[PDB]
Design a protein around this ligand. Structure first.
Ligand SMILES: O=C(O)CNC(=O)C(=O)O
Ligand SMILES: [Mg+2]
Ligand code: NI
Ligand SMILES: [Zn+2]
Length: 331
C-alpha cells in the first residue's frame, strides 16, 4: 500500500505531465496521495495562470463576510456576519490596515502559533465564495474554469444525464480568515489555486480516519451535534492542532504559497487560515473513484447547510433513499 502513514505528498509535474489533468490525478493516487486527504502540486516553471494580477481591483465582493468567533481559543465556532459590498481594491486596503494586517512574525510556525492563540479575539472579513475565474482563457493546462464537469463524470460513469453546472469560485482573504472543518459537498474532490498574495495554511485528516474527527466534533460541540447528525456540513466548527493531538486524531498540516495548487480528496476533512491578503480560486471535481464516496456521503437535512442547485441531482441519483428528507432541508 502506497503512503501508508497518510502523509501529505508534494508533486512537481513536468510541462508534459501537466497536459492531461485526469491522468495526473490518477498518477498521484497511484502513489498514495489520496491517503492524506490533501496534496500539493507545484506547476512546471513554464506555466502561468495569467499574465499579471495588476487589473483585478475592480472585481466586486458583493457580500463580504465578517467571521465572528465563539468558544475557546482551540475549540470555537464562527458565524458569518454580512457586510456591505466592496471592491477587491477596497478589500485589499482594508486587509492591509492596522486593524487587520498580519502581525510581525518570524516564520510560518510563529504565525501559526499566533493564529491559534489569538484568532477568537478578532473578527476578520473574508471575500469568499465569489463566482468567477482569474485564469486566462488561453491557459490550457490546469485551468480551473475548463475542467470536465461533475455532471459529465456522473453521466460517463453511470449513464444518466443530469441537469446542473460546475463553475469556480474566488476567495479574497486576509489575516485570520478561516475555513472551518469540512469535507466537500457530496464528498467531492476540490482543487484550489492560490493566485496571489500571502499563504494559506491547511490542516487535513486522512479519509480513512474521518469518522474519528466526527466523533471528536460531536463531543466538543454537543448542542450542535444534537441539532444535526452531520453538523460539520454547516462549515462553522474549528478545532486546533493542539486539541486534535490531545485527542489522538490523526492529521497533517501544510502551508500553500502563491502559485501552488492544492487538491483535497473525497472525504478528506480540512480546515485552515490565511496569512494575509490573498486570492484563491477553487472548484469541485469528480473522478471514477469518487462515485462510491458520493453514494455514502452524509448529509445535513436540518436546514442549515443550504447548497447549490447542482447538488440536487447528485443526491437524487446517488442517494435516492435520502433524497426526500434532504430536499425538505433545502426547502
Ligand atoms: O480557501 C478556502 O477558504 C476554503 N477552500 C477549500 O475548502 C477548498 O479549496 O476545498
Ligand atoms: Mg478589476
Ligand atoms: Ni474545501
Ligand atoms: Zn444540519
Amino acid at each position: 500500500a502506497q503512503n501508508p502513514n497518510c502523509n501529505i505528498m508534494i508533486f512537481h509535474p513536468t510541462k508534459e505531465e501537466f497536459n492531461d489533468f485526469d491522468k495526473y490525478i490518477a498518477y498521484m493516487e497511484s502513489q498514495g496521495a489520496h491517503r492524506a486527504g490533501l496534496a500539493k502540486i507545484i506547476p512546471p516553471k513554464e506555466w502561468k495562470a495569467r499574465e499579471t494580477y495588476d487589473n483585478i481591483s475592480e472585481i466586486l465582493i458583493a457580500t463580504p463576510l465578517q467571521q465572528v468567533a465563539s468558544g475557546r481559543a482551540g475549540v470555537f465556532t464562527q458565524y458569518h456576519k454580512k457586510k456591505k459590498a466592496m471592491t477587491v481594491g477596497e478589500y485589499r486596503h482594508l486587509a492591509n490596515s492596522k486593524k487587520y494586517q498580519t502581525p510581525p512574525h518570524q516564520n510560518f510556525e510563529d504565525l501559526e502559533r499566533k493564529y491559534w492563540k489569538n484568532r477568537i479575539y478578532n473578527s476578520p472579513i473574508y471575500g469568499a465564495d465569489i463566482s468567477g475565474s482569474l485564469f486566462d482563457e488561453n491557459t490550457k493546462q490546469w485551468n480551473l474554469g475548463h475542467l470536465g464537469t461533475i455532471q459529465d463524470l456522473l453521466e460517463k460513469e453511470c449513464g444518466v444525464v443530469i441537469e446542473g453546472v460546475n463553475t469556480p469560485y474566488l476567495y479574497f482573504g486576509m489575516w485570520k480568515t478561516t475555513f472551518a472543518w469540512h469535507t466537500e459537498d457530496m464528498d467531492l474532490y476540490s482543487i484550489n489555486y492560490l493566485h496571489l498574495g500571502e499563504p494559506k495554511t491547511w490542516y487535513v485528516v486522512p479519509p480513512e480516519h474521518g469518522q474519528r474527527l466526527e466523533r471528536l466534533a460531536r463531543e466538543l460541540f454537543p448542542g450542535s451535534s444534537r441539532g444535526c447528525g452531520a453538523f460539520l456540513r454547516h462549515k462553522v466548527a474549528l478545532i486546533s492542532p493542539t486539541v486534535l493531538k490531545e485527542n489522538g486524531i490523526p492529521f497533517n498540516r501544510i502551508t500553500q504559497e502563491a502559485g501552488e495548487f492544492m487538491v483535497t480528496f473525497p472525504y478528506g476533512y480540512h480546515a485552515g487560515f490565511n496569512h494575509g491578503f490573498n486570492c484563491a480560486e477553487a472548484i469541485n471535481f469528480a473522478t471514477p473513484r469518487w462515485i462510491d464516496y458520493g453514494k455514502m456521503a452524509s448529509q445535513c437535512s436540518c436546514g442549515e447547510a443550504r447548497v447549490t442547485f447542482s447538488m440536487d441531482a447528485f443526491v437524487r441519483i446517488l442517494q435516492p433513499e435520502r433524497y426526500d428528507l434532504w430536499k425538505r432541508g433545502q426547502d
